[PDB]
Every structure is written in C-alpha cells, then in structure tokens.
C-alpha cells in the first residue's frame, strides 16, 4: 500500500492505519492456523518413510562418500565448511593443501579439534562419508552416519536415526513460511571451470561454453566466490588473474543471445532468402 503507517504505537494509530494493520495481522494468524496441518502431515510422512532404518553395523567397508564443499550462492560465502563437515567421518584421507601430506587419516571423526586443524590449513573440501553411500544391507553403518548429535561420540549400534532425522526435518515446519552482469565484492584471484574460450579482437576473453563457472579463489587456496557466466559474455579479466575489490569482471546482454564465432573471415547468407526465409523490416527511428 502506497501510504504507510507513519504512526508508531507510542503515538496513537488512527482508524485507517489500524485497519491496514489488521489486514497484515489477520493474514499471519490465518497462515499459522492453516500451516500447522501441513507441518504435522509432513512429519507424519517423514517418520513413516524412515520407520525402519536402524544403525546396525560398525563399518560398511567402503571408500565412497559425498564431497562436502562450503556452499556459495554468489554473495559472500554463506555456510562454512566447519558447519558441514563437523562430526562426519572422512571417506579417504584428506591431503593437506600443500603437497601430498596425510593431514588427517581416512576414518577419523572430525570433532572440533580436527576441524580447527582443518581451518588453520584452509582445507578446500573434504570427501566425507554420507548415509546415502552406505553399503549396509537393511540399515546404516556406524561410520557412514557420523557424530551422535546430542552425544559427543559416534552413533551407537542401535540408535534409531530415521525417526530422529524425520522429526528434526519436520519439526521446524511451523517456523518456515507457507505463502545485468557480475559485480565482485572481495579482492582475490580468478579461476574458471567448465570453460572453452577464445580471445576476441579487442582482448576481452569471450566464452564458447554456456555452462562456465567463474570462481574467485583467494590467496590461500579455498574457494570464496562462484558465479555462472553465460555463452558469449565479455569478461574484463582472464584465467588465473588477480583483480581489485569491486572491479567489474563480467558483462553480457541477456536480451540478445550472442552467435559469436571462433575464427574470422567473410559472411555468407546460407539458405537466407528474403520473402520466405527472412523478412525485410527496415527500422523506423534509426534507418539502419
């Protein structure tokens, strides 16, 4: 509503302002009193899909597990690696970021002391054991689950993890709601992934691949920023380069899909006939 409620509660609200306030608050009470049914039915579906899964071994005997990286949406690094790899047992032994060192062994639980020795060495990402990669028939082994979470140690042989997991996902169901180009922020080094590129005539490295990931790696080794750069964008920078904080490093036009080339030469109209294939629309306000 274009006219706000300029009066607080210490000054008096008049009539219209309180009525607009009642719009805004009746919507919230209706949302909670109808949201609670979906939250409870979500907890029910979750504890009946889980329902069976019991910690029933001590090691499945595998070497597979998901690759825990810190998550980065495009702003500053949102959830650090110490939040994701706290108390989860590594899959293979993590190499120290210098060269080929056995920093942690390959079946150690990562409690707070190990995670601090991970944060000192600025470890990139940890290949850690996940429950979906567990090889145990009819249950989850004790290492592929992780830390007990309300006990400091590993999960005991027996403790029902499906039900506590289903409750822990569905329990915050009440608090949840129901109803141009790239500008860098920090100052570091450039790295490109999924890149197949070419240098244009002016010098800005344009990209012949749609799915290119533009990472900003710091001077330490960890990945601090990530972005998605489209097919055919004007990169102000290049691979492995050092930039300044706030300098624009990418540019494109999303309303005009570029059909840029790899080589040079002359242009011919192959199967382009005016009258059937293409049409003649001379511009009104420009003339070109």
């Amino acid at each position: 509503i274009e006219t706000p409620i300029t009066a607080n509660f210490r000054e008096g609200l008049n009539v219209l302002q309180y009525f607009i306030s009642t719009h805004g608050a009746r919507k919230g009470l209706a949302d909670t009193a109808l949201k609670t049914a979906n939250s409870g039915y979500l907890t029910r579906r979750l504890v009946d899909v889980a329902q069976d899964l019991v910690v029933t071994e001590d090691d499945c005997g595998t070497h597979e597990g998901i690759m825990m990286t810190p998550v980065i949406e495009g702003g500053d690094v949102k959830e650090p690696l110490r939040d994701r790899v706290l108390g989860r047992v590594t899959a293979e032994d993590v190499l120290k970021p210098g060269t080929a060192d056995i920093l942690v062994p390959r079946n150690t639980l990562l409690h707070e002391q190990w995670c601090d020795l991970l944060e000192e060495n600025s470890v990139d990402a940890v290949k850690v054991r996940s429950v979906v990669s567990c090889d145990t028939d009819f249950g989850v082994c004790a290492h592929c689950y992780g830390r007990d979470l309300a006990r400091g140690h590993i999960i005991n042989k027996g403790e029902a993890i499906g039900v506590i997991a289903a409750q822990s996902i569905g329990e915050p169901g009440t608090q949840l709601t129901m109803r141009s180009s790239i500008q860098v922020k920090n100052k570091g080094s450039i790295k490109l992934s999924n890149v197949k590129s070419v240098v244009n005539s002016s010098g800005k490295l344009v990209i012949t691949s749609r799915n290119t990931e533009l990472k900003l790696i710091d001077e330490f080794g960890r990945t601090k920023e990530s972005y998605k750069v489209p097919y055919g964008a004007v990169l102000a920078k290049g691979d492995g380069e050092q930039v300044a904080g706030g300098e624009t490093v990418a540019n494109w036009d999303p309303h005009t899909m570029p059909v840029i080339t790899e080589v040079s030469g002359f242009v011919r109209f192959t199967d382009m006939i005016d009258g059937q294939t293409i049409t003649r629309q001379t511009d009104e306000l420009t003339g070109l």
């Binding site: 006990r151 506590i164 409750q167 915050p172």
Partner: protein, 251 residues
C-alpha cells in the same frame, strides 16, 4: 450397549449384517418358490449391493444411511482413516498411570527434577503405596489399604515420599514434535494442583505458561525406570538432536 435411558444405541455393523441376512432369507425363499427371472435378478442384485455395502460402504454409489442422512460405518471404515484401528488404537493408545494438569514455573528446581502435586502423586502411585503399606504391616488385606488412601491418613504421606524418591516420571507436552518433548524428571511434591516445571527445560518443550497443560506418565517396570534415568532424563538432553546447539539455553 444401551446409553443412559431405556433404549439400545446399536452399532452400524449390526444394521449391515441384519440387512444382509434379511435379504439372504428373502432370496432363499424366492428360490424355494420359483419366482421369475427379473424378481430373482433384483433379489440377487440387492444382496450383491448389501454385501458390497457391508464390506466397504460408499465405494459403490451413494452410501446407505440409517440416522439421519449420515452414512453408517462399515468394516473397512473400522480399518481405514484417521480413526481406524491403526492410527487410533494400535499406534496410539490410552494409558493408565497417567495424569494431566496445568503447568507453572517453580524456579527453585534443579534441572533433573520437577514439581508434582500431592493429589496427583497419591493417585498415580496407588499400587506402589499399596505394596509399601502391605510390607510394613500396618494393614492386612488390600481393601484396608484402599480405605486408608481413600481416607488419606497421616501415615501415607511418608509412604508417598518413600515411593517417589528415586522414581522418574515422563513429562510430556501435548503437541510433541521432536524427542525433547518427552523428558523424565524426578518428582518433588507440591502443595498445589499445578506441575512445577524447571524454566530452562521450557525452551525444549516450546512451553510458555499462558495456560499450557502437560501429561505425566509413570514408568512402571524396572527397565523403564532405568530408561527414564539413563536415556530420557532431563540432564541427558542438553543438546538438540537436530544439530549441535544446546537446548538448555537460558531463555
């Protein structure tokens, strides 16, 4: 069973079975009498629809009804639904040795103990008090003990403080969402009629004190007392199982 009065409040299945038997008797009599084809086709069709209405009512076209327009409840409707046997009597049951009252604060408590009223304590612990009274030798038969606690003499409160002492109880707030909503305490007896609940523990139950109610349950057997002390005690739940964050945070 009859309700309070002189008539029998009959179940719906008796209507269903009585109709199937009425129709089956009619069909046997018509096959005795050699009625023509269309009569016994309607008779067997009414029996088919009667059996199909008995088993799963309303899966066929519009369900039959006795009183008044509401359809009557069949066997499959004794199984299925929110109020069948699974979701209403086998997964969740009503429970003896249990109680319920309004909560209040009582901040003098240590966080392994909760306040529990004397009237609820003498009602929930009637068999332990009976066993204690029969051990001392104050009475003889069970009747005498039930008269003693029906009168509430001066000697059963010492018996009650000697059955409480190291015996945990399960406090439970009514919308239990995660496992920290059932926690086991040790009772401390309360002159009053309200459960005194230690304040830090409230942030686990999502329990404010604006009119809330909680249920108490008594672990009867010995393995259940040990599970209440060793797994479900309130000192043992100081970290939320969803993460690593402490749940006994000062509110």
């Amino acid at each position: 069973v009859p309700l309070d009065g002189g008539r029998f409040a009959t179940s719906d299945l008796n209507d269903l079975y009585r109709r199937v038997i009425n129709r089956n008797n009619r069909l046997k009599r018509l096959l005795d009498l050699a009625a023509p084809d269309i009569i016994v086709r309607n008779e067997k069709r009414m029996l088919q629809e009667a059996v199909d209405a008995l088993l799963d009512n309303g899966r066929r076209g519009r369900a039959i009804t006795g009183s008044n327009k509401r359809p009557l409840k069949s066997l499959a409707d004794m199984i299925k639904g929110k109020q069948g046997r699974f979701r209403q009597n086998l997964l969740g049951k009503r429970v003896d040795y249990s109680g319920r009252s309004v909560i209040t604060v009582g901040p003098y408590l240590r966080l392994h103990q909760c306040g529990l009223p004397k009237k609820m304590a003498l009602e929930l612990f009637k068999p332990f008090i009976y066993g204690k009274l029969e051990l001392r030798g104050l009475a003889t038969t069970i009747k005498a003990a039930k008269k003693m606690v029906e009168r509430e003499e001066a000697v059963v409160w010492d018996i009650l403080d000697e059955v409480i002492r190291e015996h945990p109880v399960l406090l439970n707030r009514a919308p239990t969402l995660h496992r920290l909503g059932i926690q086991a305490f040790e009772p401390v007896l309360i002159e009053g009629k309200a459960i005194q609940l230690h304040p830090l523990v409230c942030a686990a139950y999502n329990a404010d004190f604006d009119g809330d109610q909680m249920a108490v349950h008594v672990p009867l057997t010995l393995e259940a007392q040990l599970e209440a002390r060793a797994l479900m005690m309130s000192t043992n739940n100081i970290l939320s199982p969803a993460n690593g964050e402490p749940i006994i945070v000062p509110s």
